[PDB]
Amino acid sequence: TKPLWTRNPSDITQEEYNAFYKSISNDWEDPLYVKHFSVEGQLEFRAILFIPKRAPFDLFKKNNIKLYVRRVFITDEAEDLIPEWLSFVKGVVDSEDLPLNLSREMLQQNKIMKVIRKNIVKKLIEAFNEIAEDSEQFEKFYSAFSKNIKLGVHEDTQNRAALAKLLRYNSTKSVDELTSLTDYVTRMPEHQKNIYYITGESLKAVEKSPFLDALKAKNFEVLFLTDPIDEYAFTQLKEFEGKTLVDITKD
Amino acid sequence: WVDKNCIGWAKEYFKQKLVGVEAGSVKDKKYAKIKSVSSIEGDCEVNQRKGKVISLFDLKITVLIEGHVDSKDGSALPFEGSINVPEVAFDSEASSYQFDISIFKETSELSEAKPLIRSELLPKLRQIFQQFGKDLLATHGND
């Protein structure tokens, strides 16, 4: 039997992926999205990663991804192969090189390993973008992993910006539909040089904040950030597409 | 008999390439120029596996920038700055690079600095970075 992840993703059917996913996830639903890719050149390896439709049970074992080296399974609990904020992904990674028998750290800090981690992260972001093109599929994604996308902004200095494109919020100009930062900017008149936002413990709380009246007076949109980890993401991002992020309750 | 670290050579190449790049030509009211390369961390090894000699280099680079912009009225007010690029790697695309622009002692009157940096100095660093890899293998990448 020839390992599925090695066939060309255009010669594989959805009926097939679904199947493979179920055998490694015990899930009852079909994966939300499949990203099957191959990398060649100085670095060679293949991967088939899955994005579930729901979040797992626990609020917040990591033995998801199966690490194969030249088609030889090694461990289902590979440490440092995928960043923790991406722990929800399922699948298998097969690497051509990468030495064998690594004494703790040489397995969790290996140069080859570090390179593969960044490609997967880059790849999933590409994947996340594709999903965002499918409104219906996206809402399902964001209602399940918006938090993860936020944790991703917290720590990945290299990808921080890309992921920020996946964030969605309720603004003073968008009460019945979360809006993205991209749309926000588009709605920005030329003299407005700052993306405004306010944080609060709940939506109800911030809608009636006495700070909004002056922004509304300049007809400046204001983002509502109501999750505890939202503010740190914004201070970690600093700016978005060249525009500064500014809490309307500070300097 | 092949593994040749180059963290050393790259440190020289960028210092010799970055320092001096400018957003303007000193005269303009809005001007910026890189003062120096404060940090170059990461790895820049060049391995030789098969007819192909390679390098899976991933560098984090930071630099300091001098400049002055359009003041409230006449003469231009100065500013200190730094720019951090978390990743310049072997598989980077001209657009892959990220530029965290920071302004020291920044005032609402130093607004036009960043814009000046983003549209005038960045596309230069992007092309400078795109070339690194080549000039790297072109050297420590042949007998």
Resolution for this model in angstroms, one decimal place?
2.7
Phi-psi region of A179 (alpha: psi -120 to 50; beta: other; left: phi over 0): beta
**Interchain pair B87, A158: CB under 8 A:** yes
String of b and e for B110-137 (b: at least 16 CB within 10 Å)?
bbebbebbeebbbeebbeebeebbeebb
- The DSSP annotation for chain A comes to ---GGGS-TTSS-HHHHHHHHHHHH--SSPPSEEEEEEE-SSS-EEEEEEE-SS--SS------SEEEETTEEEESS-TTSS-GGGTT-EEEEEESS--S---GGGGSS-HHHHHHHHHHHHHHHHHHHHHHTSHHHHHHHHHHHHHHHHHHHHH-TTTHHHHHTT-EEEETTEEEEEEEHHHHHHT--TT--EEEEEE-SSHHHHHT-TTHHHHHHTT--EEEE-STTHHHHHHHH-EETTEEEEETT--
Is A168 annotated to bind ligand?
no
Contacts of B79 (CB under 8 A, 6+ apart): B66, B67, B68, B69, B103, B104, B105, B106, B110, B113
Burial of B28 (0-12, 13-18, 19+ CB in 10 A): middle
Determine the Cα angle at A204 with ends A200 and A207, to 5°: 75
Put simply, the answer to whether B111 touches A193 (Cβ < 8 Å) is: yes
Mutate one of B83, B88, B100, B118 to test the A interface: name it (highest A CB count within 10 A): B100
- Domains, chain A, ordered by start: 1-168 (3.30.230.80), 169-251 (3.40.50.11260)
Experimental method: X-ray
Q: Measured in whole angstroms, how far is the alpha carbon of residue A76 from the centre of its chain?
A: 22
Nearest to A42 among B54, B58, B111 (CB): B54
The distance of Cα A196 from the centroid of its chain, to the nearest Å, equals 23
Q: What is the distance between the alpha carbons of residues A231 and A91, in angstroms, rounded to a whole number?
A: 32
Q: What structural domains and CATH numbers belong to chain B? A: 1-143 (3.15.10.20)
Q: Which residues of B touch A114 (CB under 8 A)?
A: 58
Of A170, A178, A184, A116, the C-alpha closest to A141 is A178
Q: How many whole angstroms from its chain centre is CA B3?
A: 26
CB contact under 8 Å between B56 and A238, yes or no, is no
Residue B26: both structure tokens together: 């000193």
